Amino acid sequence: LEKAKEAIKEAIENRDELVEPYVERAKKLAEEIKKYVEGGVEAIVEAIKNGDLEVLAMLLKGIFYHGFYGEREEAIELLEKLAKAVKNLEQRLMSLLYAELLRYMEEKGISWEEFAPQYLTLITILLPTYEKLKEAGVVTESTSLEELREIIKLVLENLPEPSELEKEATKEVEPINKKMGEYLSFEELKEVVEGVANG
């Protein structure tokens, strides 16, 4: 809190630099998830337990965009439970980010398409905020989840309007991301997150 004001401010000025990498990464994850969908629950759990960021990022989008089809409560529960289970700080924060997007929509009553352009706006500002605070030693592996959510809600509270590139990229990638969250049911996602925690 407060100690990240210049980190977010500089993050909003460079947010559009992360638009193209996000689009490329999302298109790659859309094909890689099919390999791990055929691999099964045990293949996803073992990969994440051994610190595979890519598989963990695949699972995050699988949980978040599965909530687009309904029952966003369960996606919030799984994203927060997975955040505590994993040890990496970057994906800990990404899991909390997707949970806060769904939590903010339910508490405010915002529909998915009304808030879709703000997904990439929060991602492209919060990610350089994390890197800046990590480069300054403000956040670390011992940083509690409660302080990570304070960073996310601080960016989401002072969230600027989406940029032209973000609105453009949102239309390009939303159909891709929604198909990514159609393979793994909430029951399978429950098994994966439970497998990461104690499997």
Numbering used by the authors: 2 to 200
Text taken from the publication that reported this structure:
Here we present rotamer inverted fragment finder–diffusion (Riff-Diff), a hybrid machine learning and atomistic modelling strategy for scaffolding catalytic arrays in de novo proteins. We highlight the general applicability of Riff-Diff by designing enzymes for two mechanistically distinct chemical transformations, the retro-aldol reaction and the Morita–Baylis–Hillman reaction. We show that in both cases, it is possible to generate catalysts that exhibit activities rivalling those optimized by in vitro evolution, along with exquisite stereoselectivity. High-resolution structures of six of the designs revealed near-atomic active site design precision.
We obtained crystal structures of the four designs: RAD13 (kcat = 3.8 × 10−5 s−1), RAD17 (kcat not determined), RAD32 (kcat = 1.1 × 10−2 s−1), and RAD36 (kcat = 6.2 × 10−5 s−1). The crystal structures agree with the design models, having backbone Cα RMSD values between 0.68 Å and 1.2 Å. By contrast, in the active site of RAD32, the most active design for which an experimental structure could be obtained, a tyrosine of the catalytic tetrad (Tyr120) adopts a catalytically unproductive conformation. Another tyrosine, Tyr99, is positioned to compensate for this interaction, and a tenfold lower kcat of a Y99F variant confirmed its participation in the catalytic machinery. However, the exchange Y120F also led to a tenfold reduction in activity. The observed alternative conformation of Y120 concomitant with the reduced activity of Y120F hints at a potential conformational change induced by substrate binding.
